[PDB]
Curated annotation (Swiss-Prot), chain A:
Protein name (Swiss-Prot/TrEMBL): Spike protein S2'
Domain of life of the source: Viruses
Gene of this entry: S
Effect ascribed to mutating residue 18 to K: In strain: Omicron/BA.1, Omicron/BA.2, Omicron/BA.2.12.1, Omicron/BA.2.75, Omicron/BA.4, Omicron/BA.5, Omicron/BQ.1.1, Omicron/XBB.1.5, Omicron/EG.5.1
Organism annotation: Severe acute respiratory syndrome coronavirus 2
Function, as annotated: Subunit of the fusion protein that is processed upon entry into the host cell. Mediates fusion of the virion and cellular membranes by functioning as a class I viral fusion protein. Contains a viral fusion peptide that is unmasked after S2 cleavage. This cleavage can occur at the cell membrane by host TMPRSS2 or during endocytosis by host CSTL. In either case, this triggers an extensive and irreversible conformational change that leads to fusion of the viral envelope with the cellular cytoplasmic membrane, releasing viral genomic RNA into the host cell cytoplasm.
UniProt feature coiled coil, ranges: 1-42
Swiss-Prot record, chain B:
Quaternary structure and partners: Binds to host ACE2. RBD also interacts with the N-linked glycan on 'Asn-90' of ACE2. Cleavage of S generates a polybasic C-terminal sequence on S1 that binds to host Neuropilin-1 (NRP1) and Neuropilin-2 (NRP2) receptors. Interacts with host integrin alpha-5/beta-1 (ITGA5:ITGB1) and with ACE2 in complex with integrin alpha-5/beta-1 (ITGA5:ITGB1). May interact via cytoplasmic c-terminus with M protein. May interact (via N-terminus) with host bilirubin and biliverdin, thereby preventing antibody binding to the SARS-CoV-2 spike NTD via an allosteric mechanism.
Organism encoding this protein: Severe acute respiratory syndrome coronavirus 2 (2019-nCoV)
Protein's name in the database: Spike protein S1
Residues of the full protein shown: 409 to 454 of 1273
Consequence recorded when altering residue 42 to F: Decreased HLA binding to NF9 epitope. Increased binding affinity to human ACE2
Domain of life of the organism encoding this protein: Viruses
Annotated consequence of substituting residue 41 to R: Increased resistance to neutralizing antibodies. Decreases HLA binding to NF9 epitope. Increased binding affinity to human ACE2
Spans annotated as Immunodominant HLA epitope recognized by the CD8+: 37-43
Function field: Attaches the virion to the cell membrane by interacting with host receptor, initiating the infection. The major receptor is host ACE2. When S2/S2' has been cleaved, binding to the receptor triggers direct fusion at the cell membrane. When S2/S2' has not been cleaved, binding to the receptor results in internalization of the virus by endocytosis using host TFRC and GRM2 and leading to fusion of the virion membrane with the host endosomal membrane. Alternatively, may use NRP1/NRP2 and integrin as entry receptors.
Length: 50, 43
C-alpha cells in the first residue's frame, strides 16, 4: 500500500518539475510566449513528462 | 519579418508564414528601380 501510494505521489509531483522549461505550468508557457518559442518549451515539458 | 512564425506589422497584418513553412525566402535591394515612391501599401 505504501509503495503504490509513493509511486502515485511521485508521478503527480513530477508535474511541478521544469525539465529545462521556463515554468512547470502549461498555461504560463502558452500565454507568456509566442508559438515558435512556446512549442520548444513544451517539447521540453513533453520529453520530460513522457 | 519574411521568415516562419515572425512578428511585427507585416507578419501580423500583411504577410504571415506558418510556424513550419517549407521553402526559401530570397530578397534583393531594389533602390535602383522602386524608389522615387508612395504606391507601396501596407496595413
Amino acid at each position: 500500500v505504501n509503495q503504490n501510494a509513493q509511486a502515485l505521489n511521485t508521478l503527480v509531483k513530477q508535474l511541478s518539475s521544469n525539465f529545462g522549461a521556463i515554468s512547470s505550468v502549461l498555461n504560463d508557457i502558452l500565454s507568456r510566449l509566442d508559438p515558435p518559442e512556446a512549442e520548444v518549451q513544451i517539447d521540453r515539458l513533453i520529453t520530460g513528462r513522457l | 519579418q519574411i521568415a516562419p512564425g515572425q512578428t511585427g506589422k507585416i507578419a501580423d497584418y500583411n504577410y504571415k508564414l506558418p510556424d513550419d513553412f517549407t521553402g526559401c525566402v530570397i530578397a534583393w535591394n531594389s533602390n535602383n528601380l522602386d524608389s522615387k515612391n508612395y504606391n507601396y501599401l501596407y496595413r
